[PDB]
Every structure is written in C-alpha cells, then in structure tokens.
Design a protein around this nucleic acid. Structure first.
Ligand code: ZN
Ligand code: ZN
Lengths: 51, 51
DNA sequence: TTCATAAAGTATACTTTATG
DNA sequence: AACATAAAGTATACTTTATG
C-alpha cells in the first residue's frame, strides 16, 4: 500500500491510499486529489459526482 | 476521560470528550452537541461563532 | 516577534449506506 | 431477496491557524 497509483478516471498521479474497503486487503481504496473522487484499485468504478 | 461534563456555555449535558488540545493532558477539549461549540475544560473560553 | 493556549481545520480509520 | 463490493459517511485523532 506504499506505491502511488494513477487515477483511473482522470490519469493524475496526485493520489493517495486511504483505507482497505470492506475490511479486505484486496480492496485498497485510493483518492485522487485532482478529481476529488475515490476509487478501489482493481475493482470496478461507477460514475460518481466530481467533488 | 469518559465522565460527561456540562457545557459551560449553554449548560447542556449532551457533550463529548474529543481530544487533548496542544498535546497537553491538562487541556481536555470537549464538544457540546447542543450549542455546537468546543471548549477546553479548565481553560479560558472566548466568544466563538455558535455552529 | 515569540509563545502558550483557544480555536479551527484536516487526515485517519472505522462504520453505514448504496448499488447491481 | 440477498450479498459482495462501491460508495458514502463519521467518530477519532492529529495538525494548523488564531488569539492575547
Ligand atoms: Zn483523479
Ligand atoms: Zn453548549
């Protein structure tokens, strides 16, 4: 959970790991400070409001 | 601290300990859910925007 | 023109709800 | 329906700013 990952939605590198979603080590959830949106790495994404 | 303390501002008992201000154990800072204002128990209080 | 303390702000890590 | 996962929410714990 150290490596910095690009945002799949906006492609920025200004991202940060936040927490493991659903108590699962296979669901590392990140945040993209640029698009103000979370994503779960390796999981599916849905269209959420930017902000 | 877990003892519930009355809010010196509005007198309510719906208050909660939150944290030690300034990393000082002598500044236990509480929050009054009623008036929506923080206070440091035993410290000086100032007129702050309620809310 | 510096510092302890009061207030305000923000990151963390959990919990609650939404989605398909 | 219902269940795992995506998203959203929130107590907690820290950091930064304001005040006198
Ligand atoms: Zn992004
Ligand atoms: Zn009060």
């Amino acid at each position: 959970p150290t490596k910095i990952l690009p945002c799949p939605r906006c492609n920025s590198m200004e991202t940060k790991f936040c927490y493991y979603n659903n108590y699962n080590v296979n669901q590392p959830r990140h945040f993209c400070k640029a698009c103000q949106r979370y994503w779960t790495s390796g999981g599916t994404m849905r269209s959420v409001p930017i902000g």
